[PDB]
Design a protein around this motif. Structure first.
Motif, mmCIF file in Angstrom:
data_model
loop_
_atom_site.group_PDB
_atom_site.id
_atom_site.type_symbol
_atom_site.label_atom_id
_atom_site.label_comp_id
_atom_site.label_asym_id
_atom_site.label_seq_id
_atom_site.Cartn_x
_atom_site.Cartn_y
_atom_site.Cartn_z
ATOM 1 N N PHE A 26 -5.709 -10.228 1.970
ATOM 2 C CA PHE A 26 -4.988 -9.005 2.286
ATOM 3 C C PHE A 26 -3.514 -9.245 2.576
ATOM 4 O O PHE A 26 -2.832 -8.330 3.040
ATOM 5 C CB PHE A 26 -5.647 -8.299 3.473
ATOM 6 C CG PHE A 26 -7.065 -7.888 3.218
ATOM 7 C CD1 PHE A 26 -7.346 -6.771 2.453
ATOM 8 C CD2 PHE A 26 -8.119 -8.618 3.736
ATOM 9 C CE1 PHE A 26 -8.653 -6.390 2.212
ATOM 10 C CE2 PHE A 26 -9.424 -8.240 3.498
ATOM 11 C CZ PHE A 26 -9.689 -7.125 2.734
ATOM 12 N N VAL A 27 -3.008 -10.447 2.311
ATOM 13 C CA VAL A 27 -1.629 -10.801 2.631
ATOM 14 C C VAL A 27 -0.687 -10.160 1.624
ATOM 15 O O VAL A 27 -0.957 -10.147 0.419
ATOM 16 C CB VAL A 27 -1.459 -12.331 2.658
ATOM 17 C CG1 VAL A 27 0.012 -12.715 2.671
ATOM 18 C CG2 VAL A 27 -2.168 -12.919 3.857
ATOM 19 N N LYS A 28 0.427 -9.623 2.117
ATOM 20 C CA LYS A 28 1.474 -9.059 1.267
ATOM 21 C C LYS A 28 2.467 -10.164 0.928
ATOM 22 O O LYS A 28 3.333 -10.509 1.732
ATOM 23 C CB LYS A 28 2.158 -7.889 1.960
ATOM 24 C CG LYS A 28 3.050 -7.088 1.038
ATOM 25 C CD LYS A 28 3.751 -5.989 1.784
ATOM 26 C CE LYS A 28 4.590 -5.152 0.849
ATOM 27 N NZ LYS A 28 5.050 -3.897 1.502
ATOM 28 N N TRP A 29 2.345 -10.713 -0.271
ATOM 29 C CA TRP A 29 3.132 -11.858 -0.689
ATOM 30 C C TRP A 29 4.533 -11.439 -1.130
ATOM 31 O O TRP A 29 4.797 -10.258 -1.359
ATOM 32 C CB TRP A 29 2.410 -12.587 -1.817
ATOM 33 C CG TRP A 29 1.058 -13.089 -1.413
ATOM 34 C CD1 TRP A 29 -0.145 -12.571 -1.770
ATOM 35 C CD2 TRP A 29 0.776 -14.208 -0.567
ATOM 36 N NE1 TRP A 29 -1.159 -13.290 -1.202
ATOM 37 C CE2 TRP A 29 -0.621 -14.305 -0.458
ATOM 38 C CE3 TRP A 29 1.568 -15.136 0.111
ATOM 39 C CZ2 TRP A 29 -1.244 -15.292 0.298
ATOM 40 C CZ3 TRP A 29 0.950 -16.111 0.859
ATOM 41 C CH2 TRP A 29 -0.443 -16.183 0.947
ATOM 42 N N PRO A 30 5.462 -12.390 -1.224
ATOM 43 C CA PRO A 30 6.778 -12.075 -1.787
ATOM 44 C C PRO A 30 6.668 -11.594 -3.227
ATOM 45 O O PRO A 30 5.698 -11.869 -3.934
ATOM 46 C CB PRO A 30 7.531 -13.407 -1.703
ATOM 47 C CG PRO A 30 6.832 -14.177 -0.672
ATOM 48 C CD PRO A 30 5.405 -13.760 -0.691
ATOM 49 N N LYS A 31 7.698 -10.863 -3.658
ATOM 50 C CA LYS A 31 7.682 -10.237 -4.977
ATOM 51 C C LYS A 31 7.478 -11.254 -6.096
ATOM 52 O O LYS A 31 6.885 -10.926 -7.128
ATOM 53 C CB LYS A 31 8.980 -9.455 -5.186
ATOM 54 C CG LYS A 31 9.083 -8.725 -6.512
ATOM 55 C CD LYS A 31 8.533 -7.313 -6.429
ATOM 56 C CE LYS A 31 9.267 -6.377 -7.380
ATOM 57 N NZ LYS A 31 8.342 -5.513 -8.169
ATOM 58 N N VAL A 32 7.943 -12.490 -5.907
ATOM 59 C CA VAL A 32 7.780 -13.518 -6.932
ATOM 60 C C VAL A 32 6.311 -13.910 -7.076
ATOM 61 O O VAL A 32 5.835 -14.193 -8.181
ATOM 62 C CB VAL A 32 8.676 -14.733 -6.614
ATOM 63 C CG1 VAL A 32 8.211 -15.461 -5.352
ATOM 64 C CG2 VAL A 32 8.737 -15.680 -7.789
ATOM 65 N N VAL A 33 5.576 -13.950 -5.966
ATOM 66 C CA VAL A 33 4.159 -14.287 -6.022
ATOM 67 C C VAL A 33 3.366 -13.151 -6.651
ATOM 68 O O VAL A 33 2.425 -13.381 -7.418
ATOM 69 C CB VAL A 33 3.645 -14.634 -4.615
ATOM 70 C CG1 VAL A 33 2.149 -14.886 -4.630
ATOM 71 C CG2 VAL A 33 4.380 -15.834 -4.079
ATOM 72 N N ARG A 34 3.725 -11.908 -6.330
ATOM 73 C CA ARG A 34 3.019 -10.763 -6.887
ATOM 74 C C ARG A 34 3.222 -10.661 -8.392
ATOM 75 O O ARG A 34 2.295 -10.305 -9.123
ATOM 76 C CB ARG A 34 3.475 -9.479 -6.199
ATOM 77 C CG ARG A 34 3.368 -9.519 -4.694
ATOM 78 C CD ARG A 34 3.559 -8.140 -4.101
ATOM 79 N NE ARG A 34 4.488 -8.148 -2.980
ATOM 80 C CZ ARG A 34 5.474 -7.278 -2.822
ATOM 81 N NH1 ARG A 34 5.681 -6.305 -3.691
ATOM 82 N NH2 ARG A 34 6.275 -7.392 -1.768
ATOM 83 N N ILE A 35 4.429 -10.956 -8.872
ATOM 84 C CA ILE A 35 4.710 -10.810 -10.296
ATOM 85 C C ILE A 35 3.960 -11.862 -11.107
ATOM 86 O O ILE A 35 3.454 -11.574 -12.196
ATOM 87 C CB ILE A 35 6.228 -10.852 -10.542
ATOM 88 C CG1 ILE A 35 6.871 -9.565 -10.031
ATOM 89 C CG2 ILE A 35 6.547 -11.032 -12.022
ATOM 90 C CD1 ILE A 35 8.378 -9.595 -10.031
ATOM 91 N N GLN A 36 3.852 -13.087 -10.587
ATOM 92 C CA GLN A 36 3.134 -14.133 -11.310
ATOM 93 C C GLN A 36 1.625 -13.917 -11.283
ATOM 94 O O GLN A 36 0.926 -14.338 -12.211
ATOM 95 C CB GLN A 36 3.494 -15.512 -10.748
ATOM 96 C CG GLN A 36 2.760 -15.916 -9.483
ATOM 97 C CD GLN A 36 3.385 -17.108 -8.789
ATOM 98 O OE1 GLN A 36 4.469 -17.550 -9.149
ATOM 99 N NE2 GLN A 36 2.697 -17.636 -7.790
#
Ligand SMILES: [K+]
Ligand SMILES: [K+]
Ligand SMILES: [K+]
Ligand SMILES: [K+]
Ligand SMILES: [K+]
Ligand SMILES: [K+]
Ligand SMILES: [K+]
Ligand SMILES: [Mg+2]
Ligand SMILES: [Mg+2]
Ligand SMILES: [Mg+2]
Ligand SMILES: [Mg+2]
Ligand SMILES: [Mg+2]
Ligand SMILES: [Mg+2]
Ligand SMILES: [Mg+2]
Ligand SMILES: [Mg+2]
Ligand SMILES: [Mg+2]
Ligand SMILES: [Mg+2]
Ligand SMILES: [Mg+2]
Ligand SMILES: [Mg+2]
Ligand SMILES: [Mg+2]
Ligand SMILES: [Mg+2]
Lengths: 221, 245, 116
Positions: A26-36
């Motif tokens: 449920f962690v909200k990751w940085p945008k770079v992690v979400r995009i990959q």
RNA sequence: CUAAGGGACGGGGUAACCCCGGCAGAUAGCGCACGCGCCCCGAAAGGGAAUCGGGUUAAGAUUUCCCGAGCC
RNA sequence: CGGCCUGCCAACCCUGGAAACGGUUCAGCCGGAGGUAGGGUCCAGUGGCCGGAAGAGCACCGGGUGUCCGGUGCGCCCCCGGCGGCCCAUGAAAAUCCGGAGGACCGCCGUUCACGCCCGGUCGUACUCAUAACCGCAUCAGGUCUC
RNA sequence: UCCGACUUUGUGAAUACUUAUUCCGUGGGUCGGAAGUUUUGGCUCCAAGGCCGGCCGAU
């Protein structure tokens, strides 16, 4: 000791406050992690054309560890070794070496010249159009080839990072039998199957929740 | 001509709402696991007045589900709520006035207020004083519910949407005659810059389509197309009928 | 990850260790005692303060604060100031009222300086 | 210090000048390795650490200098 | 400014148990959810006495004398208290300060006590504020926020 | 401003799907599959305990 006692906590909806849990998914990751992570999911959902889907079929783990332990024998010299060989020649003032060939332009040139005896292609060349045509060229020129996991693994052999393709033109006489046994297995895959391979799409896998809710709808019939 | 008054309100310069003494947005607590699966008890600590809002608001305190903290909420108060009263929110909350329930848990005919339109909206429907919605029917296949809005329109809402049981407090407010321009002045002083309205027929043609003439008269039909440009769309807009039946 | 909120991690940062100095001139105190204490006042009102309140009046730099003033009078005249009152005059200059501690006689100091 | 409000990082728009602040962006840090984590400007009438009496000049001090007595 | 006293109008405490109801305001209103009554706690004061402080200031006599005692109020100004009324009107925020719940941790170490020691930056400060110091081309019968 | 075409724009069945796109919510805090607290206007955190820093307690 009678003073010691249990003090349990009931963890209901309106009960004791819960202990620290993992909460990783449920962690909200940085945008770079979400995009990959979304890039990996999108490639799973979208229909993948066969020329791209063929890089999913990689060399077997047993074969890969055999080939790489043999590719280690033909590593090019490092910078220090090349310097030492230059000095040794200068002291007199050699022999034709047998090493792996690398570099996409150089490997491509060898294949069309009919000098490549084995081609090793990385599965993760980020501009995929660099090597997407390579299995077709090797198959057209009758050259054994395989796709192995790791451009960084190929890069390590040639003292670089991300070699992205390796070529063997010559092997030592001490390895003629071992290289031939390797060669026939790489030919059984990747080359004799290329024609049937050119028709498999394989790119329409849905999510686990989507899969589970279609299985239920299928079971309701 | 010049820009009419109806057009100037969209710039929001002097027409912004007067909100300096407001107590905060009134809405449900954010939907979470405890509400989705059980109930959570809060206590009403105050029943307060909100400027510009006819209905009283209720201050409610919960305990945070997983943090060692207090959780203070503020929503529209249903009639009959009182200080020191326990309210319960969630799927297993009892059908009592002041409790917040999913619509799936409210039988046919129930009176509800502050009804969500989307699951987790925190309340969108029937929020003005004395207003309420009625539960008409339930659809278990689609998981939707049919409610009747204060204007009379039927609406289909997901059965997981939350509503408070009861009607909004402060009903009957508009039955009392204002009797005075000054009472109207105080009402709109805490709402918006809108109250003293000048008739368009009392204007010059540069300011309004109704302006001008040697007598105060519109001079053309006051019914206007739905697609008229701003500045032209004044009077009765897209009227299906006029007059008193 | 017991928190569902991601925070930027703490990373090492080094200090500045330049390969050459940007300024090589040492840097000299241009607001020294002679700039702080320009000259004393000798008006009739200023002379009254000497024998009535043990006070010397000075014209001081605009950049000089009360702490630099008492340090300056100590390094210039070897006297101790009890307190310093300052003002900016309507002509734009700064004027300081320097009251000496008891056991310092401003009249004797005024004689040594030359204002009397 | 905050008020109505103003500016403004990233981001968005825009040929550029410039126009947009909630659109959430690893928010740039705080306590004792460990723990926590929901920018500035804007009021000498709003909020607010702490002073009194007497004396003194041509011109100051309606609480700044002197005497005495306190406070933060 | 410091100490002691006093202790309004409200608020609170203990005893006790009220109809033949009582208490009570200009008005209200209050009482078995505990009145009247009896006895207390706290609250605020710009209240009293002492210290400061008569040595000051003032008024007289040529250093000296004195700086004292009462009364009254729908009086005026300021502040406070406590009630009542009014609203489809309910009448800022933050800095800052105080208190509290809990009790991990800790012993020759704790101490929000008294007394004692040192320090306190920058900028404004004169004057007019108006029938002559501001604006109205002016030393203009105008205009210009306050105690 | 309404309206049509193309573009964004994909996949599969005889209308369905979800990843593009769009919208809403949260301090992204219990989603999918399986297995096995109604109390009176009070407090609730940083685990007791068990078994070998580790696991259960807390599938
Ligand atoms: K116009
Ligand atoms: K108006
Ligand atoms: K009108
Ligand atoms: K007209
Ligand atoms: K101020
Ligand atoms: K002054
Ligand atoms: K004048
Ligand atoms: Mg007219
Ligand atoms: Mg017109
Ligand atoms: Mg000064
Ligand atoms: Mg600030
Ligand atoms: Mg603001
Ligand atoms: Mg920008
Ligand atoms: Mg400021
Ligand atoms: Mg002030
Ligand atoms: Mg003066
Ligand atoms: Mg009594
Ligand atoms: Mg005295
Ligand atoms: Mg005397
Ligand atoms: Mg007056
Ligand atoms: Mg304690």
């Amino acid at each position: 000791n009678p003073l010691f006692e249990k003090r349990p906590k009931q963890f209901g909806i309106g009960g004791a406050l819960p202990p620290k849990k993992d909460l990783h998914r449920f962690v909200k990751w940085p945008k770079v992690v979400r995009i990959q992570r979304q890039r990996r999911i999108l490639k799973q959902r979208l229909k993948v054309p066969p020329a791209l889907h063929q890089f999913t079929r990689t060399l077997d783990k047993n074969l890969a560890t055999n080939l790489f332990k043999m590719l280690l024998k033909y590593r090019p010299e490092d910078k220090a070794a090349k310097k030492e060989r230059l000095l040794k020649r200068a002291q007199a003032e050699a022999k034709k070496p047998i090493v792996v060939k690398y570099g996409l332009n150089h490997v491509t040139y060898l294949i069309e010249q009919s000098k490549a005896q084995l081609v090793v292609i990385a599965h993760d060349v980020d501009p995929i159009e660099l090597v997407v045509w390579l299995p077709a060229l090797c198959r057209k020129m009758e050259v054994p080839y395989c796709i192995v996991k790791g451009k960084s693994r190929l890069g390590s052999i040639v003292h670089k990072k991300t070699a992205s393709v390796l070529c063997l033109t010559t092997v030592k006489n001490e390895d003629k039998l071992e290289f031939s046994k390797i060669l026939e297995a790489i030919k059984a895959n990747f080359n004799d199957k290329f024609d049937e391979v050119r028709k498999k799409w394989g790119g329409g896998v849905m999510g686990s929740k989507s899969q589970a809710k279609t299985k239920a709808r299928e079971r309701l019939i | 001509g010049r820009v009419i008054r109806a057009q100037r309100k969209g710039a929001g310069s002097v027409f912004k709402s007067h909100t300096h003494h407001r107590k905060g947005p009134a809405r449900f607590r954010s939907l979470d696991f405890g509400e989705r699966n059980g109930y959570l008890k809060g206590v009403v600590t105050d029943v307060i007045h909100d400027p510009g809002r006819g209905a009283p608001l209720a201050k409610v305190t919960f305990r945070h589900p997983f943090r060692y903290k207090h959780q203070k909420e503020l929503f529209v108060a249903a009639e009959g709520m009182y200080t020191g009263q326990f309210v319960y929110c969630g799927r297993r909350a009892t059908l009592s006035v002041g409790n917040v329930l999913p619509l799936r848990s409210v039988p046919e005919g129930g009176v509800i207020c502050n009804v969500e339109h989307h699951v987790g909206d925190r309340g969108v429907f029937a929020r003005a004083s004395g207003d309420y919605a009625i539960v008409i029917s339930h659809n278990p296949d689609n998981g939707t519910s049919r409610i009747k809005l204060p204007s009379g329109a039927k609406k289909i809402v997901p059965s997981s949407c939350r509503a408070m049981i009861g009607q909004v407090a402060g009903g009957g407010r508009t039955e009392k005659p204002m009797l005075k321009a000054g009472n109207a002045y105080h009402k709109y002083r805490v709402k918006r810059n809108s109250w003293p309205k000048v008739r368009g027929v009392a204007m010059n043609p540069v300011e309004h389509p109704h302006g001008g003439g040697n007598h105060q008269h519109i001079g053309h039909a006051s019914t206007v197309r739905r697609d008229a440009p701003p500045g032209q769309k004044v009077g009765l807009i897209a009227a299906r009928r006029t007059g008193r039946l | 990850r017991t928190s569902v909120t991601f925070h930027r991690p703490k990373t090492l940062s080094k200090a500045r260790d330049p390969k050459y100095p940007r300024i090589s001139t040492p840097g000299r105190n241009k607001l020294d005692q002679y700039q702080i204490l320009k000259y004393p006042l000798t008006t009739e009102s200023a002379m009254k303060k000497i024998e009535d309140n043990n006070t010397l009046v000075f014209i001081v730099d605009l950049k000089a604060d009360k702490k630099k003033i008492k340090a300056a009078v100590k390094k210039m005249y070897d006297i101790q100031a009890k307190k310093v009152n300052t003002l900016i005059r309507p002509d734009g200059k700064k004027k300081a009222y320097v009251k000496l501690t008891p056991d310092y006689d401003a009249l004797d100091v005024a004689n040594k300086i030359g204002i009397i």
